[PDB]
Structure formats: structure tokens, C-alpha cells
RNA sequence: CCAAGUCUCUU
RNA sequence: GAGACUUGG
């Protein structure tokens, strides 16, 4: 493998790529399901069966 | 007093196995000794009393499972953490509507989850209690 | 992907995989400096296996 | 431990002379029970190429060792050879000087 | 509302610090100088309760070796933890701990740790 | 009783 | 961990 080393070259690449500021957004989780949940399963149940 | 913080934190308070298989050595001790499985039925009945009689009246099942099968927990488990030689596992479960969120650690995976597990009840007794 | 400037980068992750995915995402940076330095220090006369 | 202290002794000795600063890199390696190589108490390290490999492909160029290179290990021919301790044995004699 | 990367896992490194700290009593390193360097922490330390600590030790107005030496802890602000520990001499073998955030502990029979400490801070507040 | 290194093998 | 081996003290 080879690549880019100087300083010089660093400089010269990042003209191109960029290292973009990242974040992470989270969001509570729950584990409550409706009913129609219950429904649609119990249908997919029987017909699997 | 557990001091106060920010992480309810809780780890296992480890059992020597010693202590249970020594128990087991004078019984199977007493045994031989007397030959008499009705005296050792009463040594064993006079040492297991009090134990025999809260069981009866509430049987403890598996501590996981009993965070499971709790009707108002609804537990929820991260993903296990490895830093260096400790194990990391966070509980999220719900209490009275307000979500409280614990931690545990163990020496290993199962452990750390154990001990996660183990706090949750504690705390979830507290307020049932 | 990211390769615009002040590019923004954006993780969505539920919370109880927070830290996990934490762990995770320093464990890929560590690599990567480490990718970066085994090839900038590394020198060889032979250059070829 | 000798190795480690007198290796660090000579870090700081390139690290305070002009003429020496950029000609001299001191690396060293001892045997088994082996000693830290670090001045960190961190407990993991971000560097991972090893010193005898250096020495083989010239990174560094000054060694510190103890009776560990002396057999066995292949190394490029070098220009000078320093016991720092007094010489005890005719064989280690023989092998430092070859 | 935007969550950055490098708080959570300043968080996700304190909570194994919190937990290593809560089992081990200490003794992490919660101290943020350098191994080499964190020698000199005492004497960082504040110097108003420094130059408090050096007229406290040059003082002789006290009447015990033990007087004087938590003098000298109470200007220093801190309260070392004293337990016995278990040995095969006559005269009990004691131990001390000094609580701060370096983990600095030692032991001295009763009769000389009281000045063993003494000296200990003669040594150290330079 | 002390060091060094080695080796099998423990963390 | 156990040690083992070589060399020397």
C-alpha cells in the first residue's frame, strides 16, 4: 500500500475530502403496541398455519 | 446507606461456592455417620425451617425471569460494554409511570446483566414496598 | 459521503444503544488513526511482498 | 530495569544537545517478565510496532538491550557495539563482538 | 436539540470511572497530571493553604505529635482515614490514608507513624 | 543467599 | 501459578 504522507499533501487532499462535523441523535424508545398489532399478527399466525 | 449519586449503579455480591459445598459435606457427614436417612431428614428439616417455610409462601424464580414477568416493569436491557476487565449492562424499566433506568456490572457478560437485573428488582420492591 | 464542506453527518440511535454505539464508533476512529500511522511511519526498501 | 532507566537517560541526553538531537534514536528490548514499555500508566498504548522490528528496518538506530540480542537474533550488521557493563563470560564476549 | 459525539463518550468513560471508583475505594486515576509529574500535586495545591500548612508544620505550640499532625490535616483541609492493620508486632501497625484525590496511603507503627507522617509533609510540601 | 537470560507455562 | 533450564555468583 502507499499514500499520501506530507503535510504539503494532507493540505492538497482535503481541497477534495472533507471531514464532515457528525452528530448523533438518539430518541427515546417504547415498547408499548396497539391492539391492531395484536390483530394483524393473530391474521398472519393463521395463515401461516 | 448507599450514598446518593447520578447512576443507580449495583454490581453482584459474589457467594463463595465453599460455603454451599462444605453445607453439603457435613449433611452427607451426618448421613454416614448415623446411617439413618430419618436422622438426617431431621438435621436437615431443624437447619432448613425457616427457609422451607418462606419458600412456601414465595417461591423465588429466576431473577431474570421475575423482571420479565413483572406485570408493571416492562424491562428493557442495552447492549453489553468491555472496558478493560469490567462488563457493563444498563437497565431501562418503568415504575409508577415515571421510566427509571439502572446499571450493573460483572466480571462478564451474564454477570453484569444479573446484577442489572438484581438492582431493578431492588428498587422495584422499594417502591412496592 | 460527506464530502461537501461543512458537510453535516447524522446518527440515529435508539437510547438504550447509546453507549454501545458509542463504543462502537470510537473503536472505528482509533482504527483509522491507526490504519493512517501503520502506513505513514511503516518504511520498507523492498517495497513489494 | 537497567536498560529502561539508562534508555530514558539517553532520551533526555538527545532531547538536550544540538549536535546529538536528530542523529541518535535509542530504542530498547529486554527478555521475558517483560518490563513496560511505556512512562504512561495508561493502560493500553496506541503504538504497536515492536523495537527489534524497527531496528531490522532502521527505524531506530540505537539499542539498549541485555544479554537478550547477544544470541539468536538476527540483526543487520552494526557499526558499533558499547557493554556498558563490565564483560563476564568468554561465549557472550565472543557473540557480542560478532 | 443536537447531540454531539465526544459528550457521550466523555459520559461513557465516566460511568466505568464512577463504577471502578465506587468498588476499589479509590485509588483510580482520578488525579490529572502525569504519573511522572503527578508527584508534585501537593505542592500545586493551593498556596494560601500551602504557606497556612508550612507555619502549621514550623510551628511547635503543640502539645502531641498526634495535635500537630491533624493541625497540619485541618489547614491542609483534608481528612486522612486512620485503620490498624493486622501484623505480627507488639505495638499495633496502623495504617492511614490521606482521602484526596491521590491515592496516598501508608502504614507506621502507632508510636512513630503519627511522626512518620510528620516527616512525610516535612518531605512533601516542597 | 543474588543477578541475568532462557524455556515450558500462568495474566 | 508452577516452575524448569543455562550461566554466574
Not at chain 2, 39 to 53: A, D, G, H, K, M
Not at chain 5, 18 to 47: I, Q
Request: aromatic share 10%.
Amino acid at each position: 500500500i502507499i499514500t499520501v504522507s506530507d503535510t504539503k499533501e494532507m493540505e492538497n487532499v482535503m481541497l477534495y475530502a472533507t471531514k464532515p462535523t457528525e452528530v448523533m441523535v438518539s430518541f427515546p424508545h417504547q415498547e408499548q403496541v396497539l391492539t391492531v398489532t395484536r390483530l394483524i399478527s393473530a391474521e398472519i399466525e393463521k395463515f401461516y398455519v | 446507606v448507599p450514598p446518593k449519586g447520578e447512576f443507580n449503579m449495583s454490581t453482584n455480591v459474589d457467594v463463595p461456592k465453599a460455603l454451599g459445598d462444605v453445607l453439603e459435606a457435613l449433611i452427607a457427614a451426618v448421613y454416614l455417620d448415623c446411617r439413618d436417612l430419618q436422622r438426617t431428614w431431621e438435621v436437615i428439616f431443624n437447619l432448613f425451617e425457616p427457609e422451607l417455610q418462606e419458600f412456601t409462601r414465595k417461591v423465588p424464580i429466576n431473577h431474570i425471569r421475575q423482571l420479565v414477568e413483572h406485570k408493571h416493569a416492562k424491562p428493557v436491557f442495552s447492549s453489553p460494554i468491555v472496558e478493560g476487565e469490567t462488563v457493563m449492562v444498563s437497565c431501562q424499566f418503568t415504575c409508577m409511570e415515571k421510566t427509571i433506568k439502572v446499571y450493573g456490572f460483572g466480571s462478564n457478560k451474564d454477570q453484569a446483566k444479573l446484577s442489572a437485573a438484581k438492582h431493578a428488582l431492588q428498587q422495584l420492591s422499594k417502591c412496592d414496598a | 459521503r460527506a464530502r461537501t464542506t461543512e458537510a453535516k453527518f447524522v446518527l440515529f440511535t435508539a437510547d438504550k444503544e447509546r453507549e454501545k454505539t458509542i463504543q462502537q464508533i470510537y473503536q472505528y476512529r482509533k482504527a483509522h488513526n491507526d490504519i493512517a500511522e501503520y502506513l505513514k511511519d511503516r518504511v520498507l526498501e523492498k517495497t513489494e511482498p | 530495569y537497567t536498560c529502561k532507566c539508562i534508555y530514558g537517560l539517553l532520551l533526555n541526553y538527545i532531547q538536550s544537545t544540538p549536535e546529538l538531537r536528530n542523529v541518535l534514536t535509542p530504542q530498547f528490548m529486554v527478555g521475558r517478565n517483560n518490563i513496560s514499555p511505556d512512562f504512561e500508566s495508561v493502560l493500553e498504548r496506541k503504538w504497536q510496532k515492536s523495537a527489534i522490528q524497527q531496528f531490522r528496518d532502521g527505524n531506530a538506530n540505537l539499542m539498549i538491550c541485555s544479554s537478550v540480542l547477544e544470541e539468536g537474533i538476527d540483526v543487520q550488521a552494526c557499526n558499533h557495539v558499547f557493554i556498558l557493563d563490565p564483560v563476564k563470560t568468554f561465549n557472550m564476549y565472543v557473540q557480542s563482538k560478532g | 436539540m443536537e447531540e454531539s459525539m465526544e459528550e457521550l463518550e466523555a459520559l461513557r468513560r465516566k460511568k466505568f470511572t464512577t463504577y471502578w471508583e465506587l468498588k476499589e475505594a479509590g485509588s483510580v486515576d482520578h488525579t490529572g497530571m502525569r504519573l511522572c509529574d503527578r508527584h508534585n500535586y501537593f505542592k500545586n495545591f493551593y498556596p494560601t493553604l500551602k504557606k497556612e500548612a508550612i507555619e502549621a508544620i514550623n510551628s511547635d505550640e503543640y502539645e502531641s505529635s498526634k495535635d500537630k499532625a491533624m493541625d497540619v490535616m485541618s489547614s491542609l483541609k483534608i481528612t486522612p482515614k486512620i485503620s490498624e492493620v493486622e501484623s505480627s508486632s507488639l505495638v499495633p501497625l496502623l495504617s492511614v490514608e490521606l482521602n484526596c484525590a491521590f491515592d496516598v496511603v501508608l502504614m507506621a507503627k502507632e508510636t512513630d507513624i503519627y511522626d512518620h507522617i510528620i516527616d512525610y509533609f516535612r518531605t512533601m510540601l516542597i
